[PDB]
Amino acid sequence: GFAFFAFFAGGGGFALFALFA
């Protein structure tokens, strides 16, 4: 689900975990 966009708070390549959305 699009809540995964909160991954953008990762502050680096781990923000790509937002693709889990």
Give an overview in words.
It is flat, with a radius of gyration of 7 Å. It is mostly loops and 21 residues long. It has no helix or strand.
Key attributes of the depicted protein:
helix-turn-helix motif; HTH; 21 residues; flat; little secondary structure; de novo protein
Q: How many separate helices?
A: 0
Structural class, from secondary structure content?
little secondary structure
Rg calc: 7 Å
How much of the residues is beta strand, in percent? Answer: under 5%
The biggest beta sheet reads: none
**Shape descriptor:** flat
Distance between the termini: 4 Å
Number of strands: 0
Helix content: under 10%
Summarize this entry quickly:
The chain has 21 residues and is largely without helices or strands. The relative contact order is 0.39.
Question: Mind sketching the topology for me?
Answer:
Blueprint: no helix or strand
